[PDB]
Structures are given as structure tokens and as C-alpha cells.
Design a protein around this ligand. Structure first.
Ligand SMILES: [Cs+]
Ligand SMILES: [Cs+]
Length: 138
């Protein structure tokens, strides 16, 4: 049982999704830009990811720029509420599996929390080899 908060316009998110599929399961796909998690769910995700709230903020997007979020003037809860009100601020992809939750940046972080091994070699879209045919992480 796997969930990915996916952005089809994200190379990182595309590579993650294909690595999930290459382990043999089709995840539930949540298009977070349109269907962001609830506040309770986002708080839980962040806790399980083991990263700070700020570390989840995506830079170089309109609300991060115009809300001045680069400056250290915001509590964690202020940032969480910005994320819910402006879901493009939530960096991507977040993946949930029975083993755990990770912000999969870079995409191959997902290999930590996938239960079943990659079924064959995996190469990212840009040709970066990630696992070879034997299953070794390059
Ligand atoms: Cs939701
Ligand atoms: Cs694993």
C-alpha cells in the first residue's frame, strides 16, 4: 500500500513514480497541487519524513518569492499553513509506504522505503543509471 504525492511536471516525481512501479506495485497517485493533504495529514507526513517544515518548502515558485519565505521570519505552523493554502510550496514527491515516508529528492531515496526490490535495472529519464540488472545501487 503505497501513496505518492505526485506532480507530473516534475522530473524527480516522474522518476520516483517509475521506480515505485519498477518494484512491482502501482501506487495511489495524489495530485497534491489539486488535492493537497489536510493539515492533520501534512503534519503527520512531515513528522514521519524526519525533516524540518522549512526543508519541505520548494524554492523558485511564486508564493515562496512573493511571501518572502526565504527570510527567517516564520514559525513552523505559519509555514505549514502557507503550504496548505499554496500547495506548489510543498516539495515533491512525498511517498508513503508500509515502511515509512520520505521526501524523495533525489528520486532514488524511494528505494529506502520500497519493500520489494527493483525488478530489473533502473535508469532515470536523463540516462543516470540508478540500479543495475543485478540490483546494485550505482
Ligand atoms: Cs485531502
Ligand atoms: Cs528497502
Amino acid at each position: 500500500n503505497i501513496t505518492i504525492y505526485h506532480n507530473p511536471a516534475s522530473g524527480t516525481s516522474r522518476n520516483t513514480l517509475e521506480m515505485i512501479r519498477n518494484s512491482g506495485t502501482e501506487p495511489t497517485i495524489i495530485l497534491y497541487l489539486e488535492n493537497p493533504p489536510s493539515r492533520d495529514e501534512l503534519v503527520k507526513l512531515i513528522a514521519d519524513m524526519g525533516i524540518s517544515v522549512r526543508a519541505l518548502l520548494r524554492k523558485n515558485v511564486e508564493p515562496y518569492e512573493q511571501l518572502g519565505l526565504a527570510e527567517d521570519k516564520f514559525t513552523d505552523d505559519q509555514l505549514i499553513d502557507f503550504m496548505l493554502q499554496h500547495p506548489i510550496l510543498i516539495n515533491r514527491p512525498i511517498v508513503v509506504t508500509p515502511l515509512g515516508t520520505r521526501l524523495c529528492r533525489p528520486s532514488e531515496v524511494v528505494l529506502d522505503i520500497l519493500q520489494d526490490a527493483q525488478k530489473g535495472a533502473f535508469t532515470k529519464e536523463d540516462g543516470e543509471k540508478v540500479v543495475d540488472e543485478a540490483g546494485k545501487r550505482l
